[PDB]
Design a protein around this motif. Sequence first.
Motif, mmCIF file in Angstrom:
data_model
loop_
_atom_site.group_PDB
_atom_site.id
_atom_site.type_symbol
_atom_site.label_atom_id
_atom_site.label_comp_id
_atom_site.label_asym_id
_atom_site.label_seq_id
_atom_site.Cartn_x
_atom_site.Cartn_y
_atom_site.Cartn_z
ATOM 1 N N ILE D 183 -5.511 -2.049 -8.599
ATOM 2 C CA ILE D 183 -5.334 -1.169 -7.445
ATOM 3 C C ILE D 183 -6.167 0.084 -7.695
ATOM 4 O O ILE D 183 -6.082 0.689 -8.769
ATOM 5 N N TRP D 184 -6.927 0.506 -6.683
ATOM 6 C CA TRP D 184 -7.789 1.671 -6.847
ATOM 7 C C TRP D 184 -6.943 2.940 -6.759
ATOM 8 O O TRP D 184 -6.414 3.277 -5.692
ATOM 9 N N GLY D 215 -7.021 -3.523 -4.716
ATOM 10 C CA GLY D 215 -5.950 -3.244 -3.785
ATOM 11 C C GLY D 215 -5.797 -1.760 -3.511
ATOM 12 O O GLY D 215 -6.393 -0.918 -4.178
ATOM 13 N N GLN D 216 -4.976 -1.451 -2.501
ATOM 14 C CA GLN D 216 -4.698 -0.065 -2.149
ATOM 15 C C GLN D 216 -3.241 0.284 -2.431
ATOM 16 O O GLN D 216 -2.348 -0.557 -2.273
ATOM 17 N N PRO D 217 -2.968 1.540 -2.775
ATOM 18 C CA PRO D 217 -1.573 2.011 -2.852
ATOM 19 C C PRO D 217 -0.747 1.655 -1.630
ATOM 20 O O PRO D 217 0.424 1.274 -1.774
ATOM 21 N N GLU D 219 -0.842 -0.915 0.168
ATOM 22 C CA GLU D 219 -0.461 -2.323 0.119
ATOM 23 C C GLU D 219 0.698 -2.532 -0.846
ATOM 24 O O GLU D 219 1.631 -3.275 -0.543
ATOM 25 N N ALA D 222 3.729 -1.237 1.127
ATOM 26 C CA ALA D 222 4.274 -2.175 2.106
ATOM 27 C C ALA D 222 5.141 -3.226 1.431
ATOM 28 O O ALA D 222 6.195 -3.600 1.950
ATOM 29 N N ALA D 223 4.717 -3.706 0.265
ATOM 30 C CA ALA D 223 5.530 -4.656 -0.486
ATOM 31 C C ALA D 223 6.858 -4.036 -0.898
ATOM 32 O O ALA D 223 7.898 -4.710 -0.866
#
Lengths: 253, 253, 253, 253
Positions: D183-184, D215-217, D219, D222-223
């Motif tokens: 994740i970036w 991935g993004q924070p 994302e 949302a999980a």
Amino acid sequence: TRYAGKVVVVTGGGRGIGAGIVRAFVNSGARVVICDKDESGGRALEQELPGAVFILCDVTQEDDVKTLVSETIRRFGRLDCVVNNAGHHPPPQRPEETSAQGFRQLLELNLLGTYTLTKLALPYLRKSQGNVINISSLVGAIGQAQAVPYVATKGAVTAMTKALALDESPYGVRVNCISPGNIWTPLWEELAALMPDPRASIREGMLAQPLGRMGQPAEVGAAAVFLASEANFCTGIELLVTGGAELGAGPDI
Amino acid sequence: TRYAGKVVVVTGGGRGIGAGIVRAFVNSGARVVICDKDESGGRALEQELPGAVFILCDVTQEDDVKTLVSETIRRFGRLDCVVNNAGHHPPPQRPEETSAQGFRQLLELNLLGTYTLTKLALPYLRKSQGNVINISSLVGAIGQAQAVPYVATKGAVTAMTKALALDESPYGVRVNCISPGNIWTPLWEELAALMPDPRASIREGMLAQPLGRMGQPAEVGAAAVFLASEANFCTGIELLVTGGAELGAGPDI
Amino acid sequence: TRYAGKVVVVTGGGRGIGAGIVRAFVNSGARVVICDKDESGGRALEQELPGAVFILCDVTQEDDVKTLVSETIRRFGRLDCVVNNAGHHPPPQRPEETSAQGFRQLLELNLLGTYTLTKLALPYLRKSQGNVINISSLVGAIGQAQAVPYVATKGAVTAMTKALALDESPYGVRVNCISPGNIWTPLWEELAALMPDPRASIREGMLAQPLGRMGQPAEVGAAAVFLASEANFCTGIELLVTGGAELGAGPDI
Amino acid sequence: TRYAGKVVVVTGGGRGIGAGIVRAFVNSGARVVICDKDESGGRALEQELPGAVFILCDVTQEDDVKTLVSETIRRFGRLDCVVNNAGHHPPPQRPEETSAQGFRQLLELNLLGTYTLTKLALPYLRKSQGNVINISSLVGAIGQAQAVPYVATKGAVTAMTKALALDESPYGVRVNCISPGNIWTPLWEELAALMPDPRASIREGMLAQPLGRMGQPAEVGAAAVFLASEANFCTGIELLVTGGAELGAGPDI
Ligand SMILES: NC(=O)c1ccc[n+]([C@@H]2O[C@H](COP(=O)([O-])OP(=O)(O)OC[C@H]3O[C@@H](n4cnc5c(N)ncnc54)[C@H](O)[C@@H]3O)[C@@H](O)[C@H]2O)c1
Ligand SMILES: NC(=O)c1ccc[n+]([C@@H]2O[C@H](COP(=O)([O-])OP(=O)(O)OC[C@H]3O[C@@H](n4cnc5c(N)ncnc54)[C@H](O)[C@@H]3O)[C@@H](O)[C@H]2O)c1
Ligand SMILES: NC(=O)c1ccc[n+]([C@@H]2O[C@H](COP(=O)([O-])OP(=O)(O)OC[C@H]3O[C@@H](n4cnc5c(N)ncnc54)[C@H](O)[C@@H]3O)[C@@H](O)[C@H]2O)c1
Ligand SMILES: NC(=O)c1ccc[n+]([C@@H]2O[C@H](COP(=O)([O-])OP(=O)(O)OC[C@H]3O[C@@H](n4cnc5c(N)ncnc54)[C@H](O)[C@@H]3O)[C@@H](O)[C@H]2O)c1
Ligand SMILES: O=C(c1ccc(F)c(O)c1)c1cccc(-c2ccc(O)c(O)c2)n1
Ligand SMILES: O=C(c1ccc(F)c(O)c1)c1cccc(-c2ccc(O)c(O)c2)n1
Ligand SMILES: O=C(c1ccc(F)c(O)c1)c1cccc(-c2ccc(O)c(O)c2)n1
Ligand SMILES: O=C(c1ccc(F)c(O)c1)c1cccc(-c2ccc(O)c(O)c2)n1
Ligand SMILES: OC[C@H]1O[C@@H](O)[C@H](O)[C@@H](O)[C@@H]1O
Ligand SMILES: OC[C@H]1O[C@@H](O)[C@H](O)[C@@H](O)[C@@H]1O
Ligand SMILES: OC[C@H]1O[C@@H](O)[C@H](O)[C@@H](O)[C@@H]1O
Ligand SMILES: OC[C@H]1O[C@@H](O)[C@H](O)[C@@H](O)[C@@H]1O
Ligand code: NA
Ligand code: NA
Ligand code: NA
Ligand code: NA
């Protein structure tokens, strides 16, 4: 002598992983029945190895398999272990290039052939407190590119192994599988030869493992002998023989 | 003769699984160094087994472990395999009954003791193209009730095994683990004796496996000898020796 | 509005999990095509839900599926998500009571029906950067007693999901699966009614989960909407909706 | 409104994944307490977001965590969800370059900080039938190179999640984890900047996923909202948010 006095059937035993499994069991003191649909490799192996004999048998033909079992019992008087190794990997295929009928045919070999021999062998395995070893694949667990049907068949074999392990546990019959990664076999060599750059596809196959090489049939064979002869508290396991390929790794929009 | 000429260190080798591992390696032709923090079992095992010797060593004490390695090399001239078996399961504890300090102490034994011996042994394992076997647990993978700290330590050991397998693969050192399920050992007997109904807790332990019994130290030992001596394409695996406990099962509001 | 403007096909959407998935997508703002081989439930659901319509389609009949896709596009102008839920669990069957032909037929539904719709839908999913959700089962991963064919089909679906995720990743189409455990559906009710003690089989089904109840179709539906609408960095995952059944546990000779 | 009226604590919420989780919960209608050891990011986020407030708290300091919980209850009157996100990845380190004391310190943050907040929060989570979300990592499951301590800590978190899920299931409190892949985040950027070729290390990080990006924070956020608000039949799961990195692959001597 680890498996002395025992009788083992290996399907697809005429070359590749199957032949390595045959050799490992003969070296452990067992008598081995080599099943294969092709005569060439298996007949030579029968001449080479005292303790191994060859029976022509296509595992997709139920009557061939019925005869395989009945001839094993007629000739050797017991059955202790079936190794369901016969299977095939088609050339790489994009999903849209696959067909339902090709998928059915691959299921017949990779899944239903294993199912059929196991079913016919189980009455004898119960008498001997024997065991089943299925040769699945790592790619059933992690996926593989350009191989939807093959991957599906191996996911099925691994799962079936666990279901049958549950069902046969009360009868004292263990059911396990081996999931190899890249093993250098004639199938690997054949598929590489179709690639535009065969040597580059082989080098890439070697480097997909942290250990930096592909596996050998003898190494799968040693795992099979362990499962048959010394893993008495193991049932429903998936024994990975992959060189570490499942491990590790190899701007946000 | 499967592991003839090789030198193996087994931590916590004085009883239980560790002693079973010691016996299996001696039977394979290896020389074994039994490490334990308690003298009683290990000293008797040294007298019993030609090929095994006992070194008092608490794996939580770095200087004990440094001496364990240096004495192994001084006495036997090589080191081929470390089996990190020392560990403990506390009595069942509700999460709110645990403490950070108790969790730290269990980490010291079950995780950092394994880490410390492996680190000190690796230079010698690289010279011999040897291997590491960690004794983890099935419950690291699937959880266990009333055991938050223990489960966490074993999840750590399994994961660490995979990380180190990656790091040591270029140097030819394999790193694997065994995840036993219920094995009948003095620890199992001790914990059962604390239960309000010991015999009922033991019967329940037996029936948690499809095979209907607990495992034996000798069965873990056979798995360890396989990993050390014949699993040359296996690194970073978790070899389940559980009797099938992870399998199977055992209005909507 | 989480999935507003999107078009979803749900197979076997007329009752059970499929109907729960239909409802969840309609509640998220999507238009839904209910596919089922039986008219009764799906036609009523079409009358009940604005935003849902019913198309009679047996997923084992390729021409039914071709028409399902072409009618979806004709009526709604796009396709964003296929949910492959149609499937069946036969009554409990001992392995020796199964047949190769019964196994083939179950593969046709549970595996090849999923394969066929996915194949026919993928060109449209690529245009919309849509996604595939397959309904597999926990028992593909852990096994189940008296269910060799069913377990094999679900191991295949889970593995196929991962293979196709790899193949479709360059085209921006995600492919995921949901593995439910015990969900209270008409199939569960039907199978329980065949048992000698139906109420006892249901209570046992409830207690196989740490949460102490079975799951609901709506809960599988919520997982599906998450995968379709908000899981943009998830592909090739197996999302467990099982109440914890895979966790935990439930003299040595 | 998916999580309206609920109160959530996010540790390490001042930047990176934690801040993404904070934002996702505020957007779902919850009130959020941002915990961080550093003031800079979290204080700005409190000014930015109505519904979020900042509490300075180092999760390795038990008295900081006691105050975090008591202040959450004092200010908002309930606690519904704890997200244990605070953690650190050290720079790449060869195994022989690690130390037991560095390993202990990383355990304190990545493992025991999660343990401590969860313990102190559970009495309130039981009252609200709330839930725990731990941020683990894919590398706990598959390993990572040059990261033995980090990998071990995340294997521990994933396993602990399953153990606590079992223990808290009778009390109606679900316990789940999210295992992100690349994740970036500012941590990713910081570690890349230390590499001899930062841009090449970032490109390699992007290409480790079949999806071809990190991935993004948001994302991960949302999980987390899904697990808290809609996953009522999920406990003890490991939800992979990895872009497919665990899938696929990337002469015999
Ligand atoms: N080679 C690998 O890298 C690899 C990796 C993982 C799994 N596997 C599995 O290992 C097994 C053996 O693979 P291999 O590489 O040795 O293949 P191979 O093609 O070199 O050998 C397979 C053998 O099986 C026989 N066989 C094929 N169809 C048969 C049938 N219908 N009845 C009887 N025998 C039949 C062939 O004649 C041949 O002798 C297969 O199940 C394969 O899926 C292989
Ligand atoms: N018994 C089981 O069912 C079971 C199941 C799964 C995993 N395990 C694991 O197997 C291993 C052995 O378990 P067991 O049941 O044989 O236990 P045990 O208590 O019977 O034997 C453990 C041995 O380790 C020694 N030991 C303990 N702390 C030590 C230390 N600091 N330094 C050196 N030696 C030390 C003890 O003195 C003892 O001889 C442990 O890692 C345990 O977590 C056991
Ligand atoms: N119920 C559970 O506990 C459970 C658990 C895990 C997985 N699953 C899976 O979830 C799915 C749904 O199960 P369920 O319990 O809701 O079953 P169900 O029998 O209640 O509903 C299945 C629906 O699919 C339809 N269907 C069946 N064959 C079809 C075909 N050829 N073409 C089109 N529609 C067809 C049926 O008519 C029915 O409406 C199945 O894939 C099942 O394997 C169920
Ligand atoms: N970034 C990734 O690729 C990645 C992948 C998998 C897992 N993770 C996990 O996700 C979590 C967040 O990672 P990130 O990349 O956002 O990191 P980050 O360094 O960008 O952000 C971490 C935040 O936690 C805070 N924090 C650190 N120590 C703390 C302490 N003792 N008490 C309170 N707050 C503290 C920091 O101040 C910072 O605001 C970590 O648990 C990490 O292990 C990250
Ligand atoms: O048979 C093969 C194989 C390879 C790995 C496996 F784990 C397995 O079960 C089978 C094999 C051999 C040579 C090349 C390939 C191959 C190469 C590129 C592909 O896209 C592909 O799907 C397969 N597979
Ligand atoms: O040491 C034990 C053990 C048991 C199983 C394991 F897989 C393991 O790694 C360790 C053991 C022995 C006897 C009883 C128990 C036990 C019983 C009830 C419990 O609630 C518990 O957490 C552990 N554990
Ligand atoms: O459809 C069923 C089911 C149950 C659980 C699953 F995970 C699944 O994928 C399907 C179901 C429903 C009711 C009873 C049973 C069942 C009961 C006893 C058995 O031996 C068996 O194999 C299945 N299965
Ligand atoms: O924090 C990182 C990370 C990366 C991936 C993860 F799954 C995770 O839990 C954490 C990260 C960020 C940037 C570089 C690296 C990294 C690069 C090379 C390595 O050898 C290594 O161990 C880590 N890790
Ligand atoms: O053809 C590839 C390889 O196949 C293996 O099964 C044989 O044992 C090797 O001799 C051969 O190099
Ligand atoms: O105490 C339980 C068991 O422990 C094992 O390690 C011993 O080999 C057995 O003799 C004993 O019955
Ligand atoms: O028949 C079992 C259950 O099936 C579910 O699909 C329905 O939503 C419930 O109303 C019913 O109780
Ligand atoms: O620094 C790397 C990235 O970190 C993330 O947490 C921020 O949301 C991004 O704006 C930034 O590009
Ligand atoms: Na012969
Ligand atoms: Na001796
Ligand atoms: Na309608
Ligand atoms: Na605010």
